[PDB]
Design a protein around this motif. Structure first.
Motif, PDB file in Angstrom:
ATOM      1  N   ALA A 286       8.318   0.593  -1.152  1.00 18.24           N
ATOM      2  CA  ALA A 286       9.187   1.382  -0.274  1.00 18.24           C
ATOM      3  C   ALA A 286      10.349   0.640   0.423  1.00 18.24           C
ATOM      4  CB  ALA A 286       8.351   2.156   0.738  1.00 18.24           C
ATOM      5  N   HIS A 287      11.554   0.884  -0.103  1.00 17.39           N
ATOM      6  CA  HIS A 287      12.808   0.307   0.401  1.00 17.39           C
ATOM      7  C   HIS A 287      13.681   1.366   1.041  1.00 17.39           C
ATOM      8  CE1 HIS A 287      11.920  -3.704  -1.220  1.00 17.39           C
ATOM      9  NE2 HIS A 287      11.460  -3.082  -2.323  1.00 17.39           N
ATOM     10  N   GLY A 288      13.487   1.542   2.345  1.00 14.57           N
ATOM     11  CA  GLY A 288      14.191   2.553   3.128  1.00 14.57           C
ATOM     12  C   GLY A 288      13.797   3.971   2.763  1.00 14.57           C
ATOM     13  N   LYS A 289      14.816   4.814   2.604  1.00 11.68           N
ATOM     14  CA  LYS A 289      14.637   6.219   2.240  1.00 11.68           C
ATOM     15  C   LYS A 289      14.124   6.371   0.803  1.00 11.68           C
ATOM     16  CE  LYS A 289      17.830   9.236   1.291  1.00 11.68           C
ATOM     17  NZ  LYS A 289      18.808  10.234   1.828  1.00 11.68           N
ATOM     18  N   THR A 290      14.034   5.262   0.080  1.00  9.06           N
ATOM     19  CA  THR A 290      13.752   5.368  -1.344  1.00  9.06           C
ATOM     20  C   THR A 290      12.421   4.711  -1.743  1.00  9.06           C
ATOM     21  OG1 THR A 290      14.535   3.727  -2.991  1.00  9.06           O
ATOM     22  CG2 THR A 290      16.124   4.474  -1.301  1.00  9.06           C
ATOM     23  N   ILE A 291      11.604   5.429  -2.509  1.00  8.21           N
ATOM     24  CA  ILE A 291      10.227   5.026  -2.805  1.00  8.21           C
ATOM     25  C   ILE A 291       9.860   5.059  -4.313  1.00  8.21           C
ATOM     26  CG2 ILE A 291       7.805   5.622  -2.369  1.00  8.21           C
ATOM     27  CD1 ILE A 291       9.388   7.110   0.255  1.00  8.21           C
ATOM     28  N   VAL A 292       9.133   4.031  -4.759  1.00 14.70           N
ATOM     29  CA  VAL A 292       8.592   4.041  -6.106  1.00 14.70           C
ATOM     30  C   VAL A 292       7.110   4.350  -6.034  1.00 14.70           C
ATOM     31  CG1 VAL A 292       8.345   2.907  -8.355  1.00 14.70           C
ATOM     32  CG2 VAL A 292      10.240   2.237  -6.875  1.00 14.70           C
ATOM     33  N   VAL A 293       6.754   5.533  -6.505  1.00  9.41           N
ATOM     34  CA  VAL A 293       5.365   5.925  -6.675  1.00  9.41           C
ATOM     35  C   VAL A 293       4.968   5.444  -8.065  1.00  9.41           C
ATOM     36  CG1 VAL A 293       3.747   7.906  -6.589  1.00  9.41           C
ATOM     37  CG2 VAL A 293       5.852   7.934  -5.243  1.00  9.41           C
ATOM     38  N   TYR A 294       3.827   4.771  -8.185  1.00 10.15           N
ATOM     39  CA  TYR A 294       3.322   4.398  -9.499  1.00 10.15           C
ATOM     40  C   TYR A 294       2.285   5.419  -9.982  1.00 10.15           C
ATOM     41  CZ  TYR A 294       4.625  -0.049  -7.115  1.00 10.15           C
ATOM     42  OH  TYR A 294       5.156  -1.037  -6.326  1.00 10.15           O
TER      43      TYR A 294
ATOM     44  N   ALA B 249       7.192  13.061  -6.173  1.00 11.46           N
ATOM     45  CA  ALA B 249       7.291  12.258  -7.413  1.00 11.46           C
ATOM     46  C   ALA B 249       7.027  13.010  -8.721  1.00 11.46           C
ATOM     47  CB  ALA B 249       6.374  11.045  -7.333  1.00 11.46           C
ATOM     48  N   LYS B 250       6.270  14.108  -8.631  1.00 11.52           N
ATOM     49  CA  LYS B 250       5.875  14.916  -9.790  1.00 11.52           C
ATOM     50  C   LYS B 250       6.899  16.008 -10.085  1.00 11.52           C
ATOM     51  N   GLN B 251       8.083  15.896  -9.497  1.00 16.14           N
ATOM     52  CA  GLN B 251       8.944  17.041  -9.308  1.00 16.14           C
ATOM     53  C   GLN B 251      10.402  16.768  -9.757  1.00 16.14           C
ATOM     54  OE1 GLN B 251       9.620  18.262  -5.001  1.00 16.14           O
ATOM     55  NE2 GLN B 251      11.599  17.926  -6.017  1.00 16.14           N
ATOM     56  N   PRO B 252      11.020  17.715 -10.507  1.00 15.20           N
ATOM     57  CA  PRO B 252      12.447  17.519 -10.809  1.00 15.20           C
ATOM     58  C   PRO B 252      13.342  17.576  -9.549  1.00 15.20           C
ATOM     59  CG  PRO B 252      11.426  18.937 -12.445  1.00 15.20           C
ATOM     60  CD  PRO B 252      10.447  18.816 -11.309  1.00 15.20           C
ATOM     61  N   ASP B 253      14.247  16.597  -9.480  1.00 14.57           N
ATOM     62  CA  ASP B 253      14.909  16.092  -8.264  1.00 14.57           C
ATOM     63  C   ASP B 253      14.345  14.693  -8.030  1.00 14.57           C
ATOM     64  N   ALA B 254      13.196  14.413  -8.653  1.00  5.08           N
ATOM     65  CA  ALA B 254      12.623  13.067  -8.669  1.00  5.08           C
ATOM     66  C   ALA B 254      13.302  12.257  -9.746  1.00  5.08           C
ATOM     67  CB  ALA B 254      11.127  13.112  -8.915  1.00  5.08           C
ATOM     68  N   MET B 255      12.873  11.021  -9.916  1.00  5.05           N
ATOM     69  CA  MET B 255      13.534  10.141 -10.834  1.00  5.05           C
ATOM     70  C   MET B 255      12.536   9.571 -11.831  1.00  5.05           C
ATOM     71  SD  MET B 255      16.917   8.420 -10.431  1.00  5.05           S
ATOM     72  CE  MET B 255      17.684   7.029 -11.279  1.00  5.05           C
ATOM     73  N   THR B 256      13.025   8.569 -12.560  1.00  6.10           N
ATOM     74  CA  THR B 256      12.325   7.844 -13.609  1.00  6.10           C
ATOM     75  C   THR B 256      12.506   6.351 -13.266  1.00  6.10           C
ATOM     76  OG1 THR B 256      11.908   8.327 -15.979  1.00  6.10           O
ATOM     77  CG2 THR B 256      14.016   7.181 -15.449  1.00  6.10           C
ATOM     78  N   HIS B 257      11.613   5.475 -13.744  1.00  7.12           N
ATOM     79  CA  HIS B 257      11.586   4.059 -13.282  1.00  7.12           C
ATOM     80  C   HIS B 257      10.650   3.243 -14.133  1.00  7.12           C
ATOM     81  CE1 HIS B 257      12.565   1.353  -9.739  1.00  7.12           C
ATOM     82  NE2 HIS B 257      11.465   0.696 -10.159  1.00  7.12           N
ATOM     83  N   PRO B 258      10.903   1.913 -14.261  1.00  6.68           N
ATOM     84  CA  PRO B 258       9.966   0.983 -14.922  1.00  6.68           C
ATOM     85  C   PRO B 258       8.493   1.134 -14.508  1.00  6.68           C
ATOM     86  CG  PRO B 258      11.804  -0.199 -13.828  1.00  6.68           C
ATOM     87  CD  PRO B 258      12.194   1.245 -14.006  1.00  6.68           C
ATOM     88  N   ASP B 259       8.239   1.309 -13.206  1.00  6.61           N
ATOM     89  CA  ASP B 259       6.865   1.374 -12.683  1.00  6.61           C
ATOM     90  C   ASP B 259       6.367   2.788 -12.278  1.00  6.61           C
ATOM     91  N   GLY B 260       7.194   3.814 -12.459  1.00  7.09           N
ATOM     92  CA  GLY B 260       6.735   5.194 -12.313  1.00  7.09           C
ATOM     93  C   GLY B 260       7.923   6.114 -12.156  1.00  7.09           C
ATOM     94  N   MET B 261       7.807   7.089 -11.253  1.00  6.64           N
ATOM     95  CA  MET B 261       8.954   7.879 -10.797  1.00  6.64           C
ATOM     96  C   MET B 261       9.431   7.337  -9.443  1.00  6.64           C
TER      97      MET B 261
END
Ligand SMILES: Nc1ncnc2c1ncn2[C@@H]1O[C@@H]2COP(=O)(O)O[C@H]2[C@H]1O
Ligand SMILES: Nc1ncnc2c1ncn2[C@@H]1O[C@@H]2COP(=O)(O)O[C@H]2[C@H]1O
Ligand SMILES: Nc1ncnc2c1ncn2[C@@H]1O[C@@H]2COP(=O)(O)O[C@H]2[C@H]1O
Lengths: 200, 202
Positions: free
Chosen positions: B194-202, B147-159
């Motif tokens: 956590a929705h499948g392969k995809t995760i929102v870390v706050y 999550a702290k890493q480029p290749d990561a994303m951006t999001h309302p509640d974190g990366m």
């Protein structure tokens, strides 16, 4: 060997008695070390201060290399003297100067990093694939296959303390005790005396 | 912006080949006689137990030398499988030719050796995690690292991140089910979604 003598001639060399600390983790790293005589233990620790030996290092070994290639890094581990030592030390700045005169010194440092990385990767495999029980078992097997393990009527024999096994493996001396027993009682070993007997 | 003249000078003595996603570039046990370099793409470094379970030792990316541990003493074997994680452009040079470059310009060695350094800090911290961290903390820590890493994303509640329960399990050393079990409870302590392969870390 003229390269190591040249190199040592720009170092300052000191003695460290048995059990003294040469490098503390978190300390700023701006110096390289080199073992003229003795052996040290590279160790790490958890919250409860339990220790694991990442590696024994011996005469001819570089220490504190890991901070050499980008500035502002911290020491990654504890180095403590296992026997009495003579330890040559030189700054990263001077060392980068020696590397320019004769890059072979970097070549000998990098040779050890490589070996150390193979050996540490082998140790990740173990911690990933074996449980503590198995890691104590494997450790004893390894000691028993060392050149200094001595012979026994029924298998191999080694003298180690619950304490060195505890450090090799990352658990306490008492936890080692419980588990030697469990090992004794599955007849993998016999640990009557401060000497252990290992089998087949 | 992330190549330079020393690299290009280095790269021009190499054979530069393209590998599909999922191809293994290096097999463990192979005679190590060649250095590689990732001109583009990313790889996983892998080890195995007797039962074929896989542990990911490391991710490497463009910029990264591979296949360097045989370089300094002859007759060694590859210590690990190295597998393409995306499509890769990777350079190759024999050790003998590389030893020769190091004499022409030792700076090539300093760049390789830097990387070996960082590799051993990282593998040493891993040895600490496996000995001292618990499974759930190890997963917590892996999520944080991705999550702290480029290749990561951006999001309302974190990366937000993309990684299956299996790659996770290969990074921390546990099965996929256990990963699923721990992700849930990490959901419950409000730490992720956590929705499948995809995760929102706050
Ligand atoms: N896995 C390892 N095996 C052998 N030595 C190590 C390992 N990890 C760290 N070290 C050594 O211990 C030193 C701690 O200080 P540095 O990180 O500056 O340099 C480190 C290396 O010399
Ligand atoms: N712990 C590690 N972290 C990162 N890369 C590694 C690690 N262990 C091995 N490798 C790489 O995997 C390669 C496999 O082949 P070599 O041993 O020739 O060179 C190895 C290193 O480049
Ligand atoms: N105890 C374990 N140690 C190391 N790796 C494991 C362990 N259990 C499973 N794995 C690996 O990590 C992977 C996670 O997903 P799978 O269960 O599909 O397959 C798993 C194995 O390949």
């Amino acid at each position: 060997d003229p390269t190591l003598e040249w190199f040592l001639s720009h170092c300052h060399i000191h003695k460290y008695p048995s059990k003294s600390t040469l490098i503390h983790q978190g300390e700023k790293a701006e110096t390289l070390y080199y073992i003229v005589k003795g052996s040290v233990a590279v160790l790490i620790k958890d919250e409860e201060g339990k220790e694991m030996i990442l590696s024994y290092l011996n005469q001819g070994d570089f220490i504190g290399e890991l901070g050499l290639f980008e500035e502002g890094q911290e020491r990654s581990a504890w180095v403590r003297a296992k026997t009495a030592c003579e330890v040559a030390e030189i700054s990263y700045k001077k060392f980068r100067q020696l590397i320019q005169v004769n890059p072979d010194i970097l070549m000998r440092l990098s040779a050890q990093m490589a070996r150390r990385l193979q050996v540490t990767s082998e140790k990740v495999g173990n911690l990933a694939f074996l449980d503590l029980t198995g890691r104590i078992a494997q450790t004893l097997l390894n000691l028993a296959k060392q050149p200094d393990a001595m012979t026994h009527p029924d298998g191999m024999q080694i003298k180690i303390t619950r304490q060195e096994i505890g450090q090799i493996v990352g658990c306490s001396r008492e936890t080692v005790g419980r588990i030697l027993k469990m090992l004794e009682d599955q007849n993998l070993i016999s640990a009557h005396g401060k000497t252990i007997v290992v089998y087949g």
